[PDB]
């Protein structure tokens, strides 16, 4: 029953019965999102397979550009793209 949920059931699979009072509208979560840097123009893809969290972004856009750490280009054209430079 719903009254005997305790701290021992946290992050555990529980079977529990009840009645449904309200169903919310369908929010849109992101599974596969393509991001592009504002000025660096670096294209990246983030795949998400966990949407079941609430009140918090367990997956967010990267804080900085990933072109510098990857070093994909041999020429590698101090240049910083800034904080949170990716748009979806």
């Amino acid at each position: 029953p719903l009254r005997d949920l305790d701290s021992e059931h946290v992050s555990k699979i529980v079977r529990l019965s009840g009645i449904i009072i309200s169903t919310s509208v369908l929010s849109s979560r992101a599974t596969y999102l393509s991001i592009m840097c504002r000025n660096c123009r670096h294209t990246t893809s983030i795949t998400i397979n966990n949407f079941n969290s609430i009140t918090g972004n367990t997956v967010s856009l990267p804080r900085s550009c990933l072109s510098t750490i990857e070093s994909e280009s041999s020429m590698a054209n101090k240049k910083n793209c800034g904080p949170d430079p990716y748009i979806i």
Binding site: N39, R41, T43, S45, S67, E72, S73, N77
Partner: protein, 130 residues
């Protein structure tokens, strides 16, 4: 019966006919005619303007243009576009050399002529981009 046309200038320049010693900061952002002697000539190096790439999965050719502050007279917002190794869909790109365009770039150093230089002082020099 595509490359944009350039301009060159001859004639009297008046106060703008200067020397590497005579060039000061009052002549900045001005058209100057400087006579002198070439002391250093850098190697003629190609500079990438547009790179052409091929996506074999979708079989399509992409391109990216590159600019710097030297190729333009009017300063614009510097937008550094990185070299694309991957398209928007995630497929690997192959660089198509031979379809990319490279423009020859040279640096020369123009020093004041020893005929018109002061006879004991160190000479003054300027850099010229070609």
């Amino acid at each position: 019966p595509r490359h944009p046309w350039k301009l060159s200038f001859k004639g009297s320049f008046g106060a703008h006919a200067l020397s590497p010693r005579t060039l000061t900061a009052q002549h900045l952002n001005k058209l100057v005619s400087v006579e002198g002697i070439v002391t250093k000539t850098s190697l003629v190096r190609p500079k990438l303007i547009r790179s052409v790439h091929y996506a074999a999965k979708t079989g399509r050719f992409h391109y990216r243009d590159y600019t710097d502050a030297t190729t333009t007279l009017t300063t614009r917002i510097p937008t550094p576009a990185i070299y694309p190794t991957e398209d928007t869909e995630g497929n690997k790109l192959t660089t198509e050399y031979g379809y990319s365009t490279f423009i020859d770039h040279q640096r020369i150093t123009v020093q004041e002529m020893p005929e018109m230089a002061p006879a004991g002082q160190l000479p003054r020099s300027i850099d010229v981009i070609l």
